[PDB]
Amino acid sequence: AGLPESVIWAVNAGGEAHVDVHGIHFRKDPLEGRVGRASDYGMKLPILRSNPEDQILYQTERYNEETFGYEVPIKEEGDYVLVLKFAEVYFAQSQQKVFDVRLNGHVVVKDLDIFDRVGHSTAHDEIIPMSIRKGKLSVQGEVSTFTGKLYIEFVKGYYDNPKVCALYIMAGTVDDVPKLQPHP
Numbered sequence: 001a002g003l004p005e006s007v008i009w010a011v012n013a014g015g016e017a018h019v020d021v022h023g024i025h026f027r028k029d030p031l032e033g034r035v036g037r038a039s040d041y042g043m044k045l046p047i048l049r050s051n052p053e054d055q056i057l058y059q060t061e062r063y064n065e066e067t068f069g070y071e072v073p074i075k076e077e078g079d080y081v082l083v084l085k086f087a088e089v090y091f092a093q094s095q096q097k098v099f100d101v102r103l104n105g106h107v108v109v110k111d112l113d114i115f116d117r118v119g120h121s122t123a124h125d126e127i128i129p130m131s132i133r134k135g136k137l138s139v140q141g142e143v144s145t146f147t148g149k150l151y152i153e154f155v156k157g158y159y160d161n162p163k164v165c166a167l168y169i170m171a172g173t174v175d176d177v178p179k180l181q182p183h184p
């Protein structure tokens, strides 16, 4: 299936609905008024590396002073890819904001430091392939029992607060995913 038709779930964290240049609908945040805190602080800033018509995805965020996450229903078995979108709109040195990302307890991104990877006010994406079959979730060479729900959590450590800007899940494999442009 083509790109829009292969997307099963998508969220603009801290924000309203937005359709991107590929035709992907990022839904308004389902955690509005629940756990965590929405912030539109980045709406004053140009976001480098991103396509300019889609900067609003990176200018809005959900963050928290304690661990938080999204629960996702997955209705059918198959191959999927999770894409997570981030920007650092406050700090401009390394080892200021650092956090882990977990999927059903598996650590899938260890010690993410957005500024160290891309700089200030610049797009950074993590691309995480997974498979659901025979009653199991498989991700990064690890395996556990799958019950129908995926729990995506952003873990509070010692260096400032975990955050996310947007996220989506598509059916397919890694070669099917649009990539950000190479960046210094």
Ligand SMILES: OC[C@H]1O[C@H](O[C@H]2[C@H](O)[C@@H](O)[C@H](O)O[C@@H]2CO)[C@H](O)[C@@H](O)[C@@H]1O
Pocket (backbone or CB within 6 Å): 039, 040, 041, 061, 063, 089, 090, 160, 161, 163
């Ligand atoms: O909404 C802007 C940012 O707010 C928080 O950053 C805090 C930071 O944790 C604190 O140490 C400092 O004194 O103030 C800033 C701004 O309130 C979030 O942690 C960031 O992710 C947000 O971008």
